PDB file of C-alpha atoms in Angstrom:
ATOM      1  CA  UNK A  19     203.447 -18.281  81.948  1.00  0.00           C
ATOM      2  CA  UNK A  20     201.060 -21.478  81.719  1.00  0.00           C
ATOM      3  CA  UNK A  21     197.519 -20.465  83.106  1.00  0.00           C
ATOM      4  CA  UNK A  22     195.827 -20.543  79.983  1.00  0.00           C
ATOM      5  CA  UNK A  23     196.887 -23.549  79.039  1.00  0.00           C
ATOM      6  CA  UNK A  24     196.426 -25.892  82.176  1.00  0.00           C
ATOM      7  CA  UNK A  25     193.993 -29.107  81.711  1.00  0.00           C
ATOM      8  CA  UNK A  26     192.603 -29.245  85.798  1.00  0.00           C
ATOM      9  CA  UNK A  27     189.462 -26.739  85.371  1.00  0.00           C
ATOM     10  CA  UNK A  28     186.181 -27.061  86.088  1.00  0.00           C
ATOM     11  CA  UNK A  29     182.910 -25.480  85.449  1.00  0.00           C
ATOM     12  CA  UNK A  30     181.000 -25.102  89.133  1.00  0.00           C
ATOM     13  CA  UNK A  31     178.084 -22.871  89.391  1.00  0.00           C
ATOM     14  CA  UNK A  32     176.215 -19.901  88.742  1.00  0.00           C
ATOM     15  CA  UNK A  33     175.062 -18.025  91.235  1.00  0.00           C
ATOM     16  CA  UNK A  34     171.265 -16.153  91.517  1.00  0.00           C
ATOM     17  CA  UNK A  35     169.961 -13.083  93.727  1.00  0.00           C
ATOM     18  CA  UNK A  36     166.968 -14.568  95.309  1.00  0.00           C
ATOM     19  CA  UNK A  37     164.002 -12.332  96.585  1.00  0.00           C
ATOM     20  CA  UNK A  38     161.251 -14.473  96.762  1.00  0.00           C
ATOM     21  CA  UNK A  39     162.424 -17.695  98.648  1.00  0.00           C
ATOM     22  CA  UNK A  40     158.818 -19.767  98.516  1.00  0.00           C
ATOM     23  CA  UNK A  41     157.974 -19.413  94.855  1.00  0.00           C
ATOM     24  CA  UNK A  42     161.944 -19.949  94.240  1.00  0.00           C
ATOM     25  CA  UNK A  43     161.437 -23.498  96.165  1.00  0.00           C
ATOM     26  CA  UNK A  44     158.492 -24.132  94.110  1.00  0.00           C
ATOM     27  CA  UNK A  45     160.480 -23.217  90.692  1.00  0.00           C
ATOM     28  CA  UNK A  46     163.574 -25.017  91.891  1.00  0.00           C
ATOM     29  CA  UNK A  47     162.074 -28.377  93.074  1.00  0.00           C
ATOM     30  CA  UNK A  48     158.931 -28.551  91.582  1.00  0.00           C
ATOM     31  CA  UNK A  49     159.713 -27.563  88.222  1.00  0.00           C
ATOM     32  CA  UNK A  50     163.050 -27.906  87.287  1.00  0.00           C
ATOM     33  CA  UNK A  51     162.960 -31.367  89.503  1.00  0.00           C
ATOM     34  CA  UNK A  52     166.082 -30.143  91.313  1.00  0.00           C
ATOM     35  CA  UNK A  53     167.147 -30.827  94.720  1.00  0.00           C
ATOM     36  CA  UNK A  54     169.110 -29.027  97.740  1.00  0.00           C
ATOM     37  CA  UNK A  55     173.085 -30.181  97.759  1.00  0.00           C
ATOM     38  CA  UNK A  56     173.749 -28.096 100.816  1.00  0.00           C
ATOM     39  CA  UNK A  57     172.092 -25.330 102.975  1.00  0.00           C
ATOM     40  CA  UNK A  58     174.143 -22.896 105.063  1.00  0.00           C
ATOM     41  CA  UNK A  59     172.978 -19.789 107.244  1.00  0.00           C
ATOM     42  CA  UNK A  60     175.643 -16.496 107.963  1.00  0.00           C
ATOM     43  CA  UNK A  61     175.343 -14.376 110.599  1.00  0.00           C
ATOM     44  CA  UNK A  62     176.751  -4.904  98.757  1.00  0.00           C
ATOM     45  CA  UNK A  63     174.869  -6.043 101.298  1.00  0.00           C
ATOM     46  CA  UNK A  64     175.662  -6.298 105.277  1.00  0.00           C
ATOM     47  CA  UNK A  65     173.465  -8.404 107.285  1.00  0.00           C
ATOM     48  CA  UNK A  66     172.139 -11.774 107.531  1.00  0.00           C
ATOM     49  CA  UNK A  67     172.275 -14.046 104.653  1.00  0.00           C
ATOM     50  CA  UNK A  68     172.196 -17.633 103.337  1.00  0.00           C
ATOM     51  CA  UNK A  69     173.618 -19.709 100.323  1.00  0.00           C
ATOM     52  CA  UNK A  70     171.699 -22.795  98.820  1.00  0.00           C
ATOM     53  CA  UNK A  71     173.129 -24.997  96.185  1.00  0.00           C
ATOM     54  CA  UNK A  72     170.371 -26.742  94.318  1.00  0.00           C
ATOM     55  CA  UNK A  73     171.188 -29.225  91.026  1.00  0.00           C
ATOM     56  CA  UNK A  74     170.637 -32.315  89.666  1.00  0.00           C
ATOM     57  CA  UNK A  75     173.304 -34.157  91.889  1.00  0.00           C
ATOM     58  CA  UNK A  76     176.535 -33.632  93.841  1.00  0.00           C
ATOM     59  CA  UNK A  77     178.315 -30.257  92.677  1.00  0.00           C
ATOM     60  CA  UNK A  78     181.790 -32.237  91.800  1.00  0.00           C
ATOM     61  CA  UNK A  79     179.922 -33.632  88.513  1.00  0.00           C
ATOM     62  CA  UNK A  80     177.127 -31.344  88.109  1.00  0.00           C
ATOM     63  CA  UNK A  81     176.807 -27.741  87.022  1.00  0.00           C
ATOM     64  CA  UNK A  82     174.414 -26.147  89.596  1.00  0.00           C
ATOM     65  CA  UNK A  83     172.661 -23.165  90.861  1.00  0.00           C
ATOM     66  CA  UNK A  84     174.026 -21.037  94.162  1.00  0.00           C
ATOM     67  CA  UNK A  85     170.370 -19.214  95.356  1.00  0.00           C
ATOM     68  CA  UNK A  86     171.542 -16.587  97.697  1.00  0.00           C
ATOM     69  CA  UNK A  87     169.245 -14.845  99.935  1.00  0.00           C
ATOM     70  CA  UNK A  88     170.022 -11.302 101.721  1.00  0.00           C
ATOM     71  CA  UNK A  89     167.403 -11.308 104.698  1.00  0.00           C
ATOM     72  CA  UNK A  90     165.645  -7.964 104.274  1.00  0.00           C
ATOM     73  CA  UNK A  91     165.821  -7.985 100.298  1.00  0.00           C
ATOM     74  CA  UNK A  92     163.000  -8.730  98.748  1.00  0.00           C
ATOM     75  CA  UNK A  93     163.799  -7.893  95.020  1.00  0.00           C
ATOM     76  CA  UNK A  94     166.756  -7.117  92.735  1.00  0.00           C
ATOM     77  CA  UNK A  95     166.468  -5.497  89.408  1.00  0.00           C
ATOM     78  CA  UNK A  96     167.202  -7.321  86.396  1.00  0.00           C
ATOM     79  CA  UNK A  97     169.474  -6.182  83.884  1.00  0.00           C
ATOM     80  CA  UNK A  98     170.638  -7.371  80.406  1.00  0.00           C
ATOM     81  CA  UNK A  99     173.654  -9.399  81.110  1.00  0.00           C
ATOM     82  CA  UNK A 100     172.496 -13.123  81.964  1.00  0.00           C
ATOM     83  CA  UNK A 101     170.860 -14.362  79.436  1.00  0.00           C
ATOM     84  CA  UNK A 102     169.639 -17.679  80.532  1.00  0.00           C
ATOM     85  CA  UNK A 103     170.574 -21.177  81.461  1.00  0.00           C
ATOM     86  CA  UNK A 104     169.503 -24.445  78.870  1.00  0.00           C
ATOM     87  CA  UNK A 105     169.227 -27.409  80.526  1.00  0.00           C
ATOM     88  CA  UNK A 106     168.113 -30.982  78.888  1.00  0.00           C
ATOM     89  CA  UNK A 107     164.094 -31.976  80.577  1.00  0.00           C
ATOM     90  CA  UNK A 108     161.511 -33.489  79.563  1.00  0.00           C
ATOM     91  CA  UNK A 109     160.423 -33.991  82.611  1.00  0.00           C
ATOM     92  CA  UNK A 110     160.891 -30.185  83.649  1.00  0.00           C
ATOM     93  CA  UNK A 111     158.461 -29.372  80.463  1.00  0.00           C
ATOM     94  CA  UNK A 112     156.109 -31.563  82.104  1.00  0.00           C
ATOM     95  CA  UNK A 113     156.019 -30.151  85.244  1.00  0.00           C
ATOM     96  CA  UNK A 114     155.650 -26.288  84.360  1.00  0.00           C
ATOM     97  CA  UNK A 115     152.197 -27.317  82.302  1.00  0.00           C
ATOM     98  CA  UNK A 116     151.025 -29.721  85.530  1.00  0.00           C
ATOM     99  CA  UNK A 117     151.531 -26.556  87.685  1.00  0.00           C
ATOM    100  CA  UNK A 118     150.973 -23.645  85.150  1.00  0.00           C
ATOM    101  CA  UNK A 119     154.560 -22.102  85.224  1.00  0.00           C
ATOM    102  CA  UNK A 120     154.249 -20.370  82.297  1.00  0.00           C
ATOM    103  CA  UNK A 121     155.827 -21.783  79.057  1.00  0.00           C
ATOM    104  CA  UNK A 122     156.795 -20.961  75.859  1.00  0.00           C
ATOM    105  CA  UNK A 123     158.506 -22.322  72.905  1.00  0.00           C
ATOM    106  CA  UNK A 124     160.209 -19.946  71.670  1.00  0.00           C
ATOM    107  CA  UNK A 125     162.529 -22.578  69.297  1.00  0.00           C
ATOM    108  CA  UNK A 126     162.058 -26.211  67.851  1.00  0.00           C
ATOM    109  CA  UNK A 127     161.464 -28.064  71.402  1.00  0.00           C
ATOM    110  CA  UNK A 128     163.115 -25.734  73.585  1.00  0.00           C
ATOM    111  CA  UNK A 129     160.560 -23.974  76.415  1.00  0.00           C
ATOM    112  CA  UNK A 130     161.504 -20.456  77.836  1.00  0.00           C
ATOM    113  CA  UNK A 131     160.896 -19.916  81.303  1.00  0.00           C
ATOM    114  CA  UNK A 132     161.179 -17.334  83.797  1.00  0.00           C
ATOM    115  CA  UNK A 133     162.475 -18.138  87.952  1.00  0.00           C
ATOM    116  CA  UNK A 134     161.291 -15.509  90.038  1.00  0.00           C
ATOM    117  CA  UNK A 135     163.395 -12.828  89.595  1.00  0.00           C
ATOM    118  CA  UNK A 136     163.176 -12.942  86.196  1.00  0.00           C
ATOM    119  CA  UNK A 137     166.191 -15.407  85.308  1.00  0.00           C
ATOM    120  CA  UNK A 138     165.381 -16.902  81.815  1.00  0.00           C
ATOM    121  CA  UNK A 139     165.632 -21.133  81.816  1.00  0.00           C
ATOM    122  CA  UNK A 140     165.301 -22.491  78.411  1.00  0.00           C
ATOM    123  CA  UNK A 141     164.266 -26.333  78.693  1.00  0.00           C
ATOM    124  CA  UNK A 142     164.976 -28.393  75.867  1.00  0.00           C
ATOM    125  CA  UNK A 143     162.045 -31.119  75.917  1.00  0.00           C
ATOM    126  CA  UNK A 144     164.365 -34.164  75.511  1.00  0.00           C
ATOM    127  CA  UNK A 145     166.234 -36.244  77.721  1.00  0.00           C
ATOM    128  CA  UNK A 146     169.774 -37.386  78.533  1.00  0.00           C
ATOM    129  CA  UNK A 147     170.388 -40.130  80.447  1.00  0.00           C
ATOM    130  CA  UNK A 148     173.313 -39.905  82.518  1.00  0.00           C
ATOM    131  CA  UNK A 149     174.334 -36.682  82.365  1.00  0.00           C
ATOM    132  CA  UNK A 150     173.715 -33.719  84.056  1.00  0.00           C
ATOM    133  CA  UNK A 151     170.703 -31.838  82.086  1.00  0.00           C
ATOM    134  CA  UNK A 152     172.407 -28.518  82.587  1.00  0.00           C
ATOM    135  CA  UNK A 153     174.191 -27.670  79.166  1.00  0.00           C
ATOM    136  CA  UNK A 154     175.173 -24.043  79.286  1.00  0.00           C
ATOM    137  CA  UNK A 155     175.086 -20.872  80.736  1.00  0.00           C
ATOM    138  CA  UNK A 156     174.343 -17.688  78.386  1.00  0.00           C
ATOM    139  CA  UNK A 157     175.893 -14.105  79.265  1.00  0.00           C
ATOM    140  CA  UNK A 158     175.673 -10.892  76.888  1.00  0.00           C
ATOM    141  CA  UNK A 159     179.255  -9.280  75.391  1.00  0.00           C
ATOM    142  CA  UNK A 160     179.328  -6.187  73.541  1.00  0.00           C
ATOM    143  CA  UNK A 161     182.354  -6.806  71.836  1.00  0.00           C
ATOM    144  CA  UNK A 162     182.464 -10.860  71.007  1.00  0.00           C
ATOM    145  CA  UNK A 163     186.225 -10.654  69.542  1.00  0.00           C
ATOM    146  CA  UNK A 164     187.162  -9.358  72.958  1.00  0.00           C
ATOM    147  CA  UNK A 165     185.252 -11.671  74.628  1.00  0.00           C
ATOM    148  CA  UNK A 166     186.704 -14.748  72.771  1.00  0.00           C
ATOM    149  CA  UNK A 167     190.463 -13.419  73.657  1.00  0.00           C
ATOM    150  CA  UNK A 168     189.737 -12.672  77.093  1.00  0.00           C
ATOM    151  CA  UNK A 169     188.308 -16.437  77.875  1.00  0.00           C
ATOM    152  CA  UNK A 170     189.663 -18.203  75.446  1.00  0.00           C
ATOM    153  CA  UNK A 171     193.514 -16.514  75.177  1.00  0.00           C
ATOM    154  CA  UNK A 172     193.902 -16.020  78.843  1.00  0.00           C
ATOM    155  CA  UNK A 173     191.094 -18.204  80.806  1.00  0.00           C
ATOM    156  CA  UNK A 174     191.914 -21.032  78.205  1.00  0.00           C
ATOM    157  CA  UNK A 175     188.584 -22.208  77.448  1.00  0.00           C
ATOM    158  CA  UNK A 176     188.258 -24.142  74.081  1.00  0.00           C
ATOM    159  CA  UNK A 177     185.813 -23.176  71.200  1.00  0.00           C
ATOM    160  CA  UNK A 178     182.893 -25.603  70.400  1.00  0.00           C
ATOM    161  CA  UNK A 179     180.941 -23.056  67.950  1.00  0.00           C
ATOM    162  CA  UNK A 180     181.355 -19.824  66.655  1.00  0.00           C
ATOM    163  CA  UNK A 181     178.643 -18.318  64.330  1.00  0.00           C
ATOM    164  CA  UNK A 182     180.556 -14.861  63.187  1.00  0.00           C
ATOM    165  CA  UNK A 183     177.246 -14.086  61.497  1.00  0.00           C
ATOM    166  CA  UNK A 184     175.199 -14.116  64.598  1.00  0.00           C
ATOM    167  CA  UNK A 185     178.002 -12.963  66.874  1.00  0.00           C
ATOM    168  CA  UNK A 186     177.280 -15.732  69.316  1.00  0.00           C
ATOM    169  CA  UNK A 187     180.151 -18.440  71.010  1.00  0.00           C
ATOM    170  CA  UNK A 188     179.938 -21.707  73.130  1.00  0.00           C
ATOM    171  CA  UNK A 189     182.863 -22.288  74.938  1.00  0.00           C
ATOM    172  CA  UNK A 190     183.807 -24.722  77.804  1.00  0.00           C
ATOM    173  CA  UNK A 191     186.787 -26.513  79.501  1.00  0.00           C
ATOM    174  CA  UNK A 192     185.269 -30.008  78.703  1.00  0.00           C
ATOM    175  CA  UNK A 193     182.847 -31.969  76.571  1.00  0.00           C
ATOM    176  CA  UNK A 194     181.601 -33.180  79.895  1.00  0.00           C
ATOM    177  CA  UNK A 195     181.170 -30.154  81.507  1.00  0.00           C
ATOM    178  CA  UNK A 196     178.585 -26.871  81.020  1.00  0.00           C
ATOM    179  CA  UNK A 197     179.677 -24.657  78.359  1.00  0.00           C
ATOM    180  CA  UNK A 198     179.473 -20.880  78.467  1.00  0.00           C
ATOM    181  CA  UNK A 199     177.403 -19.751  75.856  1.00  0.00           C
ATOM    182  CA  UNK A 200     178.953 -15.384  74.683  1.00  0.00           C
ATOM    183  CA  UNK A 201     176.028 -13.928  73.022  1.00  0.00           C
ATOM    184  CA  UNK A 202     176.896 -10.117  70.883  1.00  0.00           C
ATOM    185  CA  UNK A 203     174.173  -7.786  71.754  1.00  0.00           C
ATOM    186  CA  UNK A 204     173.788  -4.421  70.576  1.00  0.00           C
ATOM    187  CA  UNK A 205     172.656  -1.359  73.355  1.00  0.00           C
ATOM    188  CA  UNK A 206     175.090  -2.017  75.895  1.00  0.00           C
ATOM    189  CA  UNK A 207     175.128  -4.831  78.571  1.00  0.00           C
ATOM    190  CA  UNK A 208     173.718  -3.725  81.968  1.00  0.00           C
ATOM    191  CA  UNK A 209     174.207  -5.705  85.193  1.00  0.00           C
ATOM    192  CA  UNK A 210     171.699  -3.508  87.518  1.00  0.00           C
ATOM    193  CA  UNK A 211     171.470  -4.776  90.675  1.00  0.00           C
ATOM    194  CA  UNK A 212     170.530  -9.166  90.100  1.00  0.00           C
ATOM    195  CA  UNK A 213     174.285  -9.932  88.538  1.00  0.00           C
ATOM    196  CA  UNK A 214     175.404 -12.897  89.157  1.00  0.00           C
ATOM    197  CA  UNK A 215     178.740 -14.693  89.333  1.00  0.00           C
ATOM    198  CA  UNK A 216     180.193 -17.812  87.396  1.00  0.00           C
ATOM    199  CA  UNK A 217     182.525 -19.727  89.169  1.00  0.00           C
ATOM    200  CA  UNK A 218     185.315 -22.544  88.359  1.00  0.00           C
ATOM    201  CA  UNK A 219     187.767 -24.038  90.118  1.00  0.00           C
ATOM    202  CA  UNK A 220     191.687 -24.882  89.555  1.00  0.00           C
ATOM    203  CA  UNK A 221     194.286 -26.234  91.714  1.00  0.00           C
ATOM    204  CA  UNK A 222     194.982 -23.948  94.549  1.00  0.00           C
ATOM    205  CA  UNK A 223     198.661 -22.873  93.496  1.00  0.00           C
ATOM    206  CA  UNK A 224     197.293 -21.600  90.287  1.00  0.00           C
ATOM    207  CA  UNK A 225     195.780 -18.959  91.856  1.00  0.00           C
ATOM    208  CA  UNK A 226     198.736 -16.693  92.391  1.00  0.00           C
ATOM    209  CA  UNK A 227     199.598 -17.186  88.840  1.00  0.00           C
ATOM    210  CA  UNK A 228     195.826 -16.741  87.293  1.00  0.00           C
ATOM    211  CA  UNK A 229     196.330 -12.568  89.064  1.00  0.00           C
ATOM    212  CA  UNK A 230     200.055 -12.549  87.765  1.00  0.00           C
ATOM    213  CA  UNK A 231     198.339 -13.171  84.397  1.00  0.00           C
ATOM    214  CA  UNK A 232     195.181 -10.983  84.971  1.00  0.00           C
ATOM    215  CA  UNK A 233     197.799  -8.053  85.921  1.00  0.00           C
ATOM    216  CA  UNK A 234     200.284  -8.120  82.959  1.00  0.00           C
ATOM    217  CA  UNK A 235     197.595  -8.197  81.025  1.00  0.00           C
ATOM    218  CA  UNK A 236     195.977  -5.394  82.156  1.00  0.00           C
ATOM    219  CA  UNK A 237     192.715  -6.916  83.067  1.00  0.00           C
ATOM    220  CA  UNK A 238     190.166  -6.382  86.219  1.00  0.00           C
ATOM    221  CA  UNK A 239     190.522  -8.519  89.422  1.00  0.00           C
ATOM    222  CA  UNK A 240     187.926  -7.516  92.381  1.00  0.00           C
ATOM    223  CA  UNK A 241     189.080  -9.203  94.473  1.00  0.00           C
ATOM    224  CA  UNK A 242     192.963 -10.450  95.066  1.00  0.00           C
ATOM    225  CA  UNK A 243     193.517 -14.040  96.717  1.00  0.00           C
ATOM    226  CA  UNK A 244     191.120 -14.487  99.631  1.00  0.00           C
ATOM    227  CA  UNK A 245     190.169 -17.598 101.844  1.00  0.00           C
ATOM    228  CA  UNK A 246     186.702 -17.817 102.734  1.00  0.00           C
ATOM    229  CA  UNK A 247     185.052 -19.473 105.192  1.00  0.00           C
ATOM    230  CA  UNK A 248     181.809 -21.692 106.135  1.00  0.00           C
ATOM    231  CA  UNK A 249     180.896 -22.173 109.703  1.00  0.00           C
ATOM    232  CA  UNK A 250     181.447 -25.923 110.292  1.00  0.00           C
ATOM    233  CA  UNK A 251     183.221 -26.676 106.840  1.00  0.00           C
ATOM    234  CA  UNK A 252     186.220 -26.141 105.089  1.00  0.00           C
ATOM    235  CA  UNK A 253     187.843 -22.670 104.368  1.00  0.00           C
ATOM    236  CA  UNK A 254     188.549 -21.957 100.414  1.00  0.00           C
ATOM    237  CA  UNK A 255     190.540 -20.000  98.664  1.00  0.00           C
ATOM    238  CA  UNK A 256     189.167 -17.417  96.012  1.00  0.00           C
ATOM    239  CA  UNK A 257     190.134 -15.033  92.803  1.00  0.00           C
ATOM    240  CA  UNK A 258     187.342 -13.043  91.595  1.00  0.00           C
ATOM    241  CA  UNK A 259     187.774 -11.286  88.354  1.00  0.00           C
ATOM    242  CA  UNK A 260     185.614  -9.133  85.937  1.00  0.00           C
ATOM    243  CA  UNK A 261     185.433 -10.256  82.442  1.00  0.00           C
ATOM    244  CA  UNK A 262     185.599  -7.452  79.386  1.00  0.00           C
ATOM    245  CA  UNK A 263     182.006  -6.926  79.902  1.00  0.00           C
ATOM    246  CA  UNK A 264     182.055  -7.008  83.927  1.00  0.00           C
ATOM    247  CA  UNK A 265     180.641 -10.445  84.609  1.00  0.00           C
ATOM    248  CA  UNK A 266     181.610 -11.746  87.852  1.00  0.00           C
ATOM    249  CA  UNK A 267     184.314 -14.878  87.703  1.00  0.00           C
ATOM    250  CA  UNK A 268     185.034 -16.642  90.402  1.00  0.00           C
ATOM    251  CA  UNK A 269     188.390 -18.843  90.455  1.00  0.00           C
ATOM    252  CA  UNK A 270     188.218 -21.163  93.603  1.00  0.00           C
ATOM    253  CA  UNK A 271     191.254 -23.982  94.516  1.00  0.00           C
ATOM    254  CA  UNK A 272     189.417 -27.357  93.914  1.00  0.00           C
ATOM    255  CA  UNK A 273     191.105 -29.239  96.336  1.00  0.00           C
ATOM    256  CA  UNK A 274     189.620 -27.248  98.974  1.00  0.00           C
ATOM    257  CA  UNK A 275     186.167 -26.230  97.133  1.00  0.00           C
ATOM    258  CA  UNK A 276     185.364 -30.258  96.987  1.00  0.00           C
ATOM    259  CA  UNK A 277     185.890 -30.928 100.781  1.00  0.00           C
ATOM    260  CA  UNK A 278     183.386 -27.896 100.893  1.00  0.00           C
ATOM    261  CA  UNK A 279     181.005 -29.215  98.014  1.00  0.00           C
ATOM    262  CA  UNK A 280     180.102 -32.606  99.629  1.00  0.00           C
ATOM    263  CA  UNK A 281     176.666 -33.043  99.069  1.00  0.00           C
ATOM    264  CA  UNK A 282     174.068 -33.117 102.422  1.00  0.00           C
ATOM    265  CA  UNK A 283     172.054 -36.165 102.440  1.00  0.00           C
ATOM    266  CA  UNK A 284     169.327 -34.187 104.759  1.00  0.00           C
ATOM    267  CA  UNK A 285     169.494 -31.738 102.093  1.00  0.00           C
ATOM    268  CA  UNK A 286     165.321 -31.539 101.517  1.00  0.00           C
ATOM    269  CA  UNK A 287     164.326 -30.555 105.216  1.00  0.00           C
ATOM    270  CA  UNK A 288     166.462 -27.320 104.018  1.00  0.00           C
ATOM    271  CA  UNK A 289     163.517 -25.577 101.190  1.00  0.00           C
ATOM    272  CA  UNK A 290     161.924 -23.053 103.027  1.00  0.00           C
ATOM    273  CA  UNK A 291     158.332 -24.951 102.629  1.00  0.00           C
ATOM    274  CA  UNK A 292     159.677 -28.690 103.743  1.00  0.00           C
TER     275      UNK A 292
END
């Protein structure tokens, strides 16, 4: 009945395949000027593996990056579908030409990047003083009507532009928070094997109403209402859907993800080079 139009929702994270953990670290911290939030270890992939949060500050006002690693994987193919996240640094500009990360400006003061892996950052040489310098988050849609009804109609997130002519949308829940960027593209949209995953989070009884919503309208869920759980830390509860494209959404209860997402002040000693 009311998912889509709800007010509590909030933009979280995105999270990255990571192959190459020591030039990642460099990337992460001495580029981008990020920092660890949290570090944790777990004992289609089955083994060992570990999720890092890295951002700008504490994940219940910042937009940030989840770096997974999968020990034994050392690469992941790239596809089409993410198309880069924009964030707002000077300072990050800075830093790729005092270590030679290669650069480019590929638009009026924004700088194209690459983290290993291939992800593309796009760092607008400017700054914003306080506020989180991570503005959006850019996926590929084949169809961008569909796209628009799917996130907007049911997921409920507001319009901030739409250029018909250019097929491209920015989107978002708040003026405060990191918009999702729906760019057309023309050949297809493949995932291959680095997809990622953009999560949000709601109140926890929306969840059962968010699948409800997802069934009658005759969309994909991958996974039905889980909990999930962190050695030492609070248990969650998750809805992860596929969007008309495939992308990954996760739908996490906020109450929950925030005793979760407190921010470790030992957070440094966790890069793998500290």
């Amino acid at each position: 009945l009311y998912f889509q139009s709800m007010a509590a929702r909030r933009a979280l994270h995105f999270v990255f395949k990571v192959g190459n953990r020591f030039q990642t670290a460099r990337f992460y911290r001495d580029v981008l000027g990020m920092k660890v939030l949290r570090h944790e270890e777990f004992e289609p992939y089955d083994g060992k593996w570990s999720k890092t949060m890295v951002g700008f500050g504490p994940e219940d006002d910042h937009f940030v990056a989840e770096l997974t690693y999968n020990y034994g994987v050392g690469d992941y193919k790239l596809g089409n579908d993410f198309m880069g996240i924009t964030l707002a640094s000077s300072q990050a500009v800075s830093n790729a030409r005092k270590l030679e990360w290669p650069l480019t400006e590929v638009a009026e003061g924004v700088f194209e990047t690459e983290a290993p892996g291939g992800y593309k950052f796009y760092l607008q040489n400017r700054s914003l003083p306080q506020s989180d310098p991570v503005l959006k988050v850019t996926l590929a849609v084949s169809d961008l009507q569909k796209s628009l009804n799917y996130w907007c109609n049911l997921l409920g997130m507001k319009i901030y532009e739409n250029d018909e002519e250019k097929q491209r949308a920015l989107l978002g829940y708040a003026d405060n928070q990191c918009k999702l960027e729906l760019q057309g593209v023309k050949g297809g949209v493949d995932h291959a094997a680095a997809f990622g995953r953009i999560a949000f989070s709601c109140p926890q009884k929306e969840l059962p109403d968010l699948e409800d919503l997802m069934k009658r309208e005759n969309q994909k869920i991958l996974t039905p209402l889980v909990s999930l759980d962190t050695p030492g830390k609070a248990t969650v509860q998750v809805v992860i859907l596929a969007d008309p494209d495939g992308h990954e959404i996760c739908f996490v209860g906020d109450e929950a993800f925030r005793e979760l997402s407190k921010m470790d002040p030992e957070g440094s000693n966790c890069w793998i080079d500290s």
